[PDB]
Design a protein around this ligand. Structure first.
Ligand code: BEF
Ligand SMILES: [Mg+2]
Length: 871
């Protein structure tokens, strides 16, 4: 049996040994029967509801409602039983919708050596021991041990975050993911020419497979909003059970009938549970998701919308999220001395070259145009549809030529002698003849490292004429090279001439992987907002520090910690060091997970914005998983909870503001609904205690909570948010929703509603027996109390006149609909039969409005008193 070798094991053993265990053929390939057998055993080269709905019934509130329903059906109360059943079904469905995570969001074509080469093959068809070829712009299909690689470099930015392509060698290594120069791992593009290797791993055994297993092992933390709502539900369950028990035992001591106490406990348990709260919360979160979808962000779970409003730390993958991952020629330094700055980011025509504050196009400036032409002519990389097929620096030079408008200069020259780029050579030289005139002499264009180019150059150009090189000019060029190096740029020396050793030094170009457009401004805004932004990447110290300094995360006195130090550091000292530092470099996926888990240990709500495979574990471990919509890999977008469609960081600020507004609205309607529930519970308890018959039954309580107080609460959940709410710093997730002031307001509203409703109920009670007039008076009084409480519950600080009655059109429509429904209940004969109510005179309605305005008046009085006291 032919086992799969671990990448480290394959790198350690020589080529012959690897082929011996893998039982491979270096030249001929694999027999069809052997491929079929290994595919049958190992499998293809790929990797990857009812119980969720049932689990909602485990909630204690749902259990209490089921107990109420079964007690109701034991007696002959069919209406209460069916109403409570419908309420339970609706609550369970909306809870399942809230907890449901959406998963709605060609195989790599690899030419392996199957039978005499030239086999088109597919990514899936590979089996261990297969020999697969590689070329430029070809993604690596599976982890292959490179047994033949001539001038090979591979871009592992997605896999490991290393910007520079990794040079690949065939000889076994004496001994890290990057240190294994022999192996070429799955999912990494090949920049350089050619390679061939034996497929050591297929499926779960690839590096993608190891990171996927790490991701699956991890469990995503629960959102702060979900924790707060679970705590609130536990508090409500304890309160309801305690109140029901105390009332039951007290009344039994008083001597009330057992059947009467059961038929009253049904109403008590229905009232004490706010049924509309989960529905309203789910609807609010769904509207937030829709708004984010409008704002170029796809949220995969409803509670995630509020989560970015509570985040304290935002982490970031440097390569591909903060930086475009596309090299750009930022700076040009002419040999004469002219300084030019180049805008634009990536491989595209957008942007322009600015010289001394003046935009230069075409051949306006002969020196910079000549430098651009020299860079563009001696290139192999070609850009199609803003995608690069070739070296990154050559693509950057092509993009610069595109910006200058000289992209049609590669066609004017045809190569005669080409000198390939080599690791020891460090310079590329090409001779061309101008197409229009063959009589023109041979002209050689060369580029590469400054040292070699200036060694092969003996003259330099200035003001349209050639001058002999001197020591002073070489010193100036060296100083400019040092200045560019200190700024994080990569320096290439461009030169042209008639033959090697007689070139005219043209200038220098500074190439850097630049931050994405608008990332700097968004980072500054987020830092000013109170969020501490950290950078976690697997790249080198120099590149990470340069990018961090450009974005502003890094200062002279700031500190940076490698991944190896993190591994060596103990849990405690890691917990003290991680908050201090802001840049982490050479961080493996396990190290990124360690960093985020140590941040979460201190209590911070961590959000990471990565795009690579190495960020999948970190994204799942993070409280918010943000991924780039376009550049993000399949695994990273699988581990994310929100994806930025346009790869814009302003979407992060929009999400933060939306989360803050959603939480504020949630607080408002939670206050309203708990006030209503406590008022109903207290009214029923007081009526039962003093021998009054129960004023409200299960059907009426459910009607009030859902039909009448539903639309007003789903209008309070969409109330426009004040600027001061979203301008506040991120809150502490340990804080509860029910503040002391909120509880005070809820108790005041409950007391007033109880007093008014009990007064009406007792006044209309003729001979301690409920008459339909009493039923309709109590029902309408409670509904009007609820409408006025909803009106006064729009904001905790701003008075309604300050806000405006007609500011929220949805609220006005919901209130009008509720009033029309109540009028139908008290006037429509079928509804009168259903609810055992009666028609009411206009004077009674006026009296009810006057009595029910007291809760609003007291609420605004308390608001004014609080405002005066705050000053
Ligand atoms: F892509 Be990141 F730099 F890990
Ligand atoms: Mg990345």
């Amino acid at each position: 049996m032919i086992p799969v070798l671990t990448s480290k094991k394959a790198s350690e053993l020589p080529v012959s040994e690897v082929a011996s265990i893998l039982q491979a053929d270096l030249q001929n390939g694999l027999n069809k029967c052997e491929v079929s057998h290994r595919r049958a055993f190992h499998g293809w080269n790929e990797f990857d509801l009812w119980k969720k709905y049932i689990s909602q019934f485990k909630n204690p509130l749902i259990m209490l409602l089921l107990a109420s329903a079964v007690i109701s059906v034991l007696m002959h109360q069919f209406d209460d039983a069916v109403s409570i059943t419908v309420a339970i079904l609706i609550v369970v469905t909306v809870a399942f919708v809230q907890e449901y995570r959406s998963e709605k969001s060609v195989p790599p074509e690899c030419h392996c050596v199957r039978e005499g080469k030239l086999e088109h093959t597919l990514a899936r068809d590979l089996v261990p021991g297969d020999t697969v070829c590689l070329s430029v712009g070809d993604r690596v299909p599976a982890d292959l041990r490179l047994f033949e690689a001539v001038d090979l470099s591979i871009d592992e930015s997605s896999l490991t975050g290393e910007t520079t392509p990794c040079s690949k060698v065939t000889a076994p290594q004496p001994a890290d993911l990057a240190s294994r120069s022999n192996i070429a791992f799955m999912g990494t593009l090949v920049r350089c020419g050619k390679a061939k290797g034996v497929v050591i791993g297929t499926g779960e055994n690839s590096e993608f497979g190891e990171v996927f297993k790490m991701m699956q092992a991890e469990e995503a933390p629960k959102t702060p909003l979900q924790k707060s709502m679970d705590l609130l539900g536990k508090q409500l369950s304890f309160y309801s059970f305690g109140i029901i028990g105390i009332i039951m035992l007290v009344g039994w001591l008083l001597g009330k009938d057992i059947l009467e106490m059961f038929t009253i406990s049904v109403s008590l348990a229905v009232a004490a549970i706010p049924e509309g709260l989960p529905i309203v919360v789910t609807v609010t979160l769904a509207l937030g998701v829709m708004r984010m979808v409008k704002k170029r962000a796809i949220v995969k779970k409803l509670p995630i919308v509020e989560t970015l409003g509570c985040c304290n730390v935002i982490c970031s993958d440097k390569t591909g999220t903060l930086t475009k991952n596309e090299m750009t020629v930022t700076h040009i330094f002419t040999s004469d001395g002219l300084h030019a700055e180049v805008t634009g980011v990536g491989y595209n025509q957008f942007g322009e070259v600015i010289v001394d504050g003046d935009v230069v196009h075409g051949f306006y400036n002969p020196a910079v145009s000549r430098i651009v032409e020299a860079g563009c002519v001696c290139n192999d990389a070609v850009i199609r549809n803003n995608t690069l097929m070739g070296k990154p620096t050559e693509g950057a030079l092509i993009a610069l030529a595109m910006k200058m408008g000289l992209d049609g200069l590669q066609q004017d020259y045809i190569r005669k002698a080409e000198y390939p780029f080599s690791s020891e050579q460090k310079w590329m030289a090409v001779k061309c003849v101008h197409r229009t005139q063959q009589d023109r002499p041979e002209i050689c264009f060369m580029k590469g490292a400054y040292e070699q180019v200036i060694k092969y150059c003996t003259t330099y150009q200035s003001k349209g004429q050639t001058l002999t090189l001197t020591q002073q000019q070489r010193d100036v060029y060296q100083q400019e090279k040092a200045r560019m190096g200190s700024a994080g740029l990569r320096v290439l020396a461009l030169a042209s001439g008639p033959e090697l050793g007689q070139l005219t030094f043209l200038g220098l170009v500074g190439i850097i992987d630049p931050p994405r457009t608008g990332v700097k401004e968004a980072v500054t805004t987020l830092i000013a907002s109170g969020v501490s932004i950290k950078m976690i990447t697997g790249d080198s110290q120099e590149t990470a520090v340069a990018i961090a300094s450009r974005l502003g995360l890094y200062s002279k006195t700031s500190q940076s910690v490698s991944g190896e130090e993190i591994d060596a550091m103990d849990v405690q000292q890691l917990s003290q060091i991680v908050p201090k530092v802001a840049v982490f470099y050479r961080a493996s996926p396990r190290h990124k997970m360690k960093i985020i888990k140590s941040l979460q240990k201190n209590g911070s709500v961590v959000a990471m914005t990565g795009d690579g495979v190495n960020d999948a574990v970190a994204l799942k471990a993070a409280d918010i998983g943000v991924a780039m919509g376009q550049t993000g890999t399949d695994v990273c977008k699988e581990a994310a909870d929100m994806i930025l469609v346009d790869d814009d960081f302003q979407t992060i600020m929009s999400a933060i503001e939306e989360g803050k507004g959603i939480y504020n609205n949630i607080k408002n309607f939670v206050r309203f609904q708990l006030s209503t529930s406590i008022a109903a519970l207290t009214l029923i308890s007081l009526a039962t205690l003093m021998n009054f018959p129960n004023p409200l039954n299960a059907m009426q309580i459910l009607w009030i909570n859902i039909i009448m107080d539903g639309p007003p609460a789903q209008s309070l959940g969409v109330e426009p948010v004040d600027k001061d709410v979203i301008r506040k710093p991120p809150r502490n997730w340990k804080d509860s929703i029910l503040t002391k002031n909120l509880i005070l307001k809820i108790l005041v509203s409950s007391i007033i509603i109880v007093c008014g409703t009990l007064f009406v109920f007792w006044r209309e009670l003729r001979d301690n027996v409920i008459t339909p007039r009493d039923t309709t008076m109590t029902f309408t009084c409670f509904v009007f109390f609820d409408m006025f409480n909803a009106l006064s519950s729009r904001s905790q600080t701003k008075s309604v006149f300050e806000i405006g009655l007609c500011s929220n059109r949805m609220f006005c429509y919901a209130v009008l609909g509720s009033i029309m429904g109540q009028l139908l209940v008290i006037y429509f004969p079928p509804l009168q039969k259903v609810f055992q109510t009666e028609s009411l005179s206009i004077l009674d309605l006026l009296f009810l409005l006057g009595l029910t305005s007291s809760v609003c008046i007291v609420a605004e009085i308390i608001k004014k008193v609080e405002r005066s006291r705050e000053k």
